[PDB]
Nucleic acid binder design. Structure first.
Ligand code: MG
Ligand code: MG
Ligand code: MG
Ligand code: MG
Ligand code: MG
Ligand code: MG
Ligand code: MG
Ligand code: MG
Ligand code: MG
Ligand code: MG
Ligand code: MG
Ligand code: MG
Ligand code: MG
Ligand code: MG
Ligand code: MG
Ligand code: MG
Ligand code: MG
Ligand code: MG
Ligand code: MG
Ligand code: MG
Ligand code: MG
Ligand code: MG
Ligand code: MG
Ligand code: MG
Ligand code: MG
Ligand code: MG
Ligand code: MG
Ligand code: MG
Ligand code: MG
Ligand code: MG
Ligand code: MG
Ligand code: MG
Ligand code: MG
Ligand code: MG
Lengths: 114, 56, 209, 120, 122, 5
RNA sequence: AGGACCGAACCGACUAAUGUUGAAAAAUUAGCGGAUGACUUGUGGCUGGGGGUGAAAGGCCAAUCAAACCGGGAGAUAGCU
RNA sequence: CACAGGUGGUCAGGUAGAGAAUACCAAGGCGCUUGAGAGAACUCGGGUGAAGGAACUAGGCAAAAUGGUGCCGUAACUUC
RNA sequence: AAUUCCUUGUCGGGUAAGUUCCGACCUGCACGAAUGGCGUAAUGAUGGCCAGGCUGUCUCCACCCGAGACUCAGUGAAAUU
RNA sequence: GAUGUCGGCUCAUCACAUCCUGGGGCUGAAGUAGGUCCCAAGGGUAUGGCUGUUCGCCAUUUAAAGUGGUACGCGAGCUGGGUUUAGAACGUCGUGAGACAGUUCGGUCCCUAUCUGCCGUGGGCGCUGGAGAACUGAGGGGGGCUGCUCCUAGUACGAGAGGACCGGAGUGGACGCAUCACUGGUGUUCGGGUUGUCAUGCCAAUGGCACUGCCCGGUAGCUAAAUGCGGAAGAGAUAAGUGCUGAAAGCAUCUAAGCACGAAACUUGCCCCGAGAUGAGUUCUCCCUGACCCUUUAAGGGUCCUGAAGGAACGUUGAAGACGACGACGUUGAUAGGCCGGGUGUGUAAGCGCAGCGAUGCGUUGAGCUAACCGGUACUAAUGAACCGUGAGGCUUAACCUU
């Protein structure tokens, strides 16, 4: 699969930062409003990350206007511009799917002060 | 579920035409010990490919 | 129009500046050496016999190697034929590469499907499964009735039944050509194609047009 | 379907299958040569050989890991004291399978499995 | 994936709390209604003194689903619950005057520009 | 088993 | 105190599946009812066929019951096959 | 029948537990008299499941679910 | 109505839609007072109906773990004809 | 001396007196939308509430929710709710035993497939020397549905309301095919958390059992809900039908001679099987160039020499597979395992120190472990051979190469 590796390698984003499950991440995504392009910020807690090279993706959960929302971002897609870690959280599990059943105080994540 | 007529000897024989066994095509000879054996199997005295694989 | 024989390297994702992701099957098309030309005067039809790849010299039968020697070509994986229309001609030993598809918008891909072995009617023919409860006795996913009593007194030919599924030639039509990379002998086609990774693959111009 | 899957079930559940190879693996370490059915010998390769690789480097953590996979201190001592040093230079392939006909009781195919350095 | 017998929350102030889908319009044997699809619904719970009452048969457009919405780049947007906006049966126009919760871009059509304008997010 | 009346 | 309550042994047999040339001529598996009482159980005894016994289903009376089983009248009779 | 049935008493260990339930063990006794491979349909006994949640069906059949201690609290109807 | 033929009677409730269910009407084919009438707390492996929870019951099946099925060695049936 | 019922489920197949889609004639057909008749069977031709129901009514959809035959198709395929055993009760009839196309509650659905048929998959032989490949395509099968929006055009039409045909574009429903790149499911062969108990002497650390003990995540593979594609244009001959020229019949007349158009039907076009197509085809390569002996002297038998092409067998095995089969490889070798490196998944191992009375926390440390995956590596196993298969391939005639 060296052919696939070269094809995927040539189009992998290079400025991807380092982030982990449980850290609050803000992602800038291109949104097209007619002819004019625009950027909107989606900020939330990273509850799941899959690393597959070009096919890597991560899931961000946020509560917006009283409704829970989950977005699965393709990290290397051109749609996403930059990733910023506003806060670093310490968790014991790779996947935080249990957060879906909690809200408010029960959903708090302790900060990772390494 | 069960037959309506007794099948004949002929039908019985034809069904058994494919039940015949096949003999081993040939038997390999150990390079040094000299006993005939199945290919890729050790000989009676434990030899294989000219080396005494098994002590017994 | 003449096609080419390639190998299913795998599947990949191609990103576009507009933000759209195109799933592309990567097909490697090495040099296609023509081994024989079929003529009306001798064979009754116009076609070209081609071979691709290489195979170990210890396993090329001189009946096959002699065929390659006749055309002065190195033995390939196998032999395939393509029909010739009125306007195209070729010479024995000519090497054809992936640029032939550089001017082709759509291609036709054929290959052997993945073998599912002995498949039941539910999997093979999308038969509806019967009740899993409510008294059903050993007939949860059985085919059911297969006839209409005495009047026909038989099962009609072509009745859908359990049997071998897959492992057969299949053609997928009207696949967009995303990109042609003649510097690495690769062809990218949108969508999936029959067969597993590394299987022989035949690519032809879209007949449907 | 069985596409690209590995590991023979051998008509046993996971618990029984795991236990059998733990005992058989210890037997091969204790006795440099054993007799068993051909399919079992092939499956055993994926159990005993990794243990020998673990014994290549001697450490408290590795010994405890070996103990968890054999549950026999005598085998663990054999792995790290004798087998490890002997196979220090070999890059895998610490076991060899030899076919020895068929079992009289049920005609099962039998094959000897042994360490490659049994020569003495 | 919205079918018959599925319960949906109401994302508008028409007065209904949760409605019951009774038909997936737009085809024969059609069984699924994603975001932006119109469905026939019956109101099950509603607030008093609202402009709609329990037992009314209307149609609504799905604005949020647990199964989520797929984007061209492969990204998927999921919501914690299914929601819909009630529409007038004859004119297929929104009945409520305010939308609750985030809305998805797939309803960016001339027939649903009213919902997008009134939506709080995107 | 069966009956016919 | 209780023909009281929950629940094992014990005695029952409501549902489902399996089995239906069964492991079994009535069972197994998972649930289920009673479980100090009109309870259950060991040993022995008594009631005999137009009779017994029956909280009553024509149930049961040795895998047999709108009249048990065995022998006899008997080679009943059969305008039927 | 070397049959997944039936058959009355006596003895009653350890940890957890209200317990002779249940789990793992002691003493003690066993692995049930065809095996070896393969890992198709289908059947049997089980595990998990995206979104929906009785739309199944004669019928929520079957499955899933509830499940223990204390403490708070508990309606109509009651022969109290 | 365990009783009603006509009959899915008529009206109301429940459902988006109810030959069933609940309430009422009385035109009771063919209720009725110890072969008992009408009520009735509690009880029921009892009949009908509804709701919450719950789910592969289903939309629509997918995967997996075991015992058969399949192959090899040994033993070796049956109904039927 | 036995042909098992209503309905449901599953799976269907045919007819055309056609429900939708297609082509037309009339219309009391302005348009839109209808009415009626003709041709057309290629495809398609609802989910629910009540009831055992078919049916029917009702709710809401659809381009339409066609009518029938097939033992009122289909119980050695399922179900057993209804009828139609034994129990019991109501009303009713009878003095009574009992009885009721009256109503109520409860109530055993057996069969391991011999043959035909059908769905798959092999063996044998044949195709006239043998062998390895690629093909021609006689034949056969699969596929054939359709909505909505936009443009043409608010144009034709109409007083207005309303509102096109004919042609284009886009996006859907259902169905079918393929595949795992993505989103997910599963993942009892990968990590981790945790309850009870037992054991490894003990602490520590681990293992067994308890549905995988209960759980949280998960690689490969499989897979749909996931995402790619498909139905067609085009051609030929036509149905109903509309026409050209044109007589029989000075006219007329689509017809008798001669021409043209005409539909999802038909033959092709697209996809798949296919020379057992015994009518057994074609093309391109490869292999064999010896002695004799007998009489029943002929497509004769037999001995010696010879054993080619190739195949089979065995072994390592496969995203091939029930078994056969099929594909890869066998040292002149990456076929499988292991090994090395990497990637995934889990989430900071063990040991030791540092803080705390302690549970525990922190440091070493994104550590340790890591299945099927990726790129490599002969460390292990794929043996030197034997086995099968031969030695120039009938006759007649013809056309050539000839003497
Ligand atoms: Mg396969
Ligand atoms: Mg049964
Ligand atoms: Mg079953
Ligand atoms: Mg016939
Ligand atoms: Mg077995
Ligand atoms: Mg276990
Ligand atoms: Mg009591
Ligand atoms: Mg009790
Ligand atoms: Mg029981
Ligand atoms: Mg009686
Ligand atoms: Mg008896
Ligand atoms: Mg007499
Ligand atoms: Mg007599
Ligand atoms: Mg026994
Ligand atoms: Mg116990
Ligand atoms: Mg299995
Ligand atoms: Mg689910
Ligand atoms: Mg239904
Ligand atoms: Mg139940
Ligand atoms: Mg349960
Ligand atoms: Mg009433
Ligand atoms: Mg009375
Ligand atoms: Mg009682
Ligand atoms: Mg056998
Ligand atoms: Mg008869
Ligand atoms: Mg046609
Ligand atoms: Mg209906
Ligand atoms: Mg209901
Ligand atoms: Mg019938
Ligand atoms: Mg039936
Ligand atoms: Mg039948
Ligand atoms: Mg019944
Ligand atoms: Mg009568
Ligand atoms: Mg300890």
């Amino acid at each position: 699969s060296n052919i696939i590796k070269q094809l995927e390698q040539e189009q992998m984003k290079q400025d991807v930062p380092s982030f982990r499950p449980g850290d609050t991440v803000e992602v800038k995504v291109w949104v097209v409003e007619g002819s004019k392009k625009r950027l909107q910020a989606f900020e939330g807690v990273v509850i799941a990350i899959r690393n597959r090279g070009l096919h890597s993706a991560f899931t961000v959960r946020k509560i917006s206007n009283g409704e829970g929302v989950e977005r699965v971002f393709q990290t290397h897609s051109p749609v996403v511009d930059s990733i910023s870690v506003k806060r670093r959280g310490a968790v014991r599990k790779a996947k935080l799917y249990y957060l879906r059943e909690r809200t408010g105080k029960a959903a708090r994540i302790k900060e990772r002060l390494n | 579920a069960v037959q309506q007529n007794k099948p004949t000897r002929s039908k019985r024989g034809m069904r058994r035409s494919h039940d015949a066994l096949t003999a081993v095509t040939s038997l390999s000879v150990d390079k040094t010990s000299g006993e005939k054996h199945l290919r890729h199997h050790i000989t009676a005295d434990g030899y294989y490919r000219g080396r005494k694989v098994i002590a017994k | 129009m003449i096609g080419l024989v390639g190998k299913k390297v795998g599947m990949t994702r191609i990103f576009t500046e507009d933000g759209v992701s195109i799933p592309v099957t990567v097909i490697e098309v090495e040099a296609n050496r023509v081994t024989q030309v079929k003529d009306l005067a001798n064979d009754g039809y116009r076609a070209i016999q081609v071979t691709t790849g290489a195979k170990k010299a210890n396993r090329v039968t001189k009946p096959e190697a002699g065929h390659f020697a006749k055309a002065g070509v190195e033995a390939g994986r196998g032999l395939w034929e393509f029909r010739l229309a009125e306007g195209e001609e070729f010479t024995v030993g000519q090497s054809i590469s992936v640029e032939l598809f550089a001017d082709v918008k759509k291609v036709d891909v054929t290959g052997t499907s993945k073998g599912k072995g002995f498949a039941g009617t539910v999997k093979r023919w999308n038969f509806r499964t019967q009740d899993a409860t409510h008294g059903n006795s050993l007939s949860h996913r059985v085919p059911g009735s297969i006839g209409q009593n005495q009047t026909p007194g038989k099962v009609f030919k072509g009745k859908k039944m359990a049997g071998q599924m897959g492992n057969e030639r299949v053609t997928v039509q009207s696949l967009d050509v995303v990109r042609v990379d003649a510097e690495r002998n690769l062809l990218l086609v949108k969508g999936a194609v029959p067969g597993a990774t590394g299987s022989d693959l035949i690519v032809k111009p879209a007949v449907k047009a | 379907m069985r596409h690209r899957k590995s590991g023979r079930q051998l008509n046993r559940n996971s618990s029984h299958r795991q236990a059998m190879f733990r005992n058989m693996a210890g037997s091969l370490v204790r006795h440099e040569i054993i007799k068993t059915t051909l399919p079992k010998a092939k499956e055993l390769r994926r159990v005993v050989e990794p243990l020998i690789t673990l014994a290549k480097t001697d450490s408290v953590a590795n010994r405890r890991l070996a103990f968890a996979r054999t549950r026999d201190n005598e085998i663990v001592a054999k792995l790290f004291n004798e087998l490890g040093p002997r196979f220090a230079s070999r890059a895998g392939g610490y076991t060899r399978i030899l076919k020895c006909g068929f079992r009289a009781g049920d005609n099962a195919p039998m094959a000897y499995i042994e360490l490659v350095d049994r020569s003495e | 994936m919205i079918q018959e017998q599925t319960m949906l929350n109401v994302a508008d102030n028409s007065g209904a709390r949760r409605v019951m889908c009774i038909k997936v319009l737009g085809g024969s044997h059609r069984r699924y209604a994603g975001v932006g699809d119109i469905i026939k619904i019956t109101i099950k719970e509603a607030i008093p003194r609202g402009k709609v009452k329990k037992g009314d048969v209307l149609k609504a457009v799905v604005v949020r689903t647990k199964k989520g919405v797929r984007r061209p780049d492969g990204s998927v947007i999921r919501f914690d619950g299914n929601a819909c906006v009630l529409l007038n049966n004859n004119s297929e126009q929104p009945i409520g005057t305010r939308i609750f919760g985030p809305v998805t871009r797939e309803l960016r059509s001339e027939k649903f520009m009213k919902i997008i304008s009134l939506a709080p997010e995107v | 088993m069966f009956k016919a009346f």
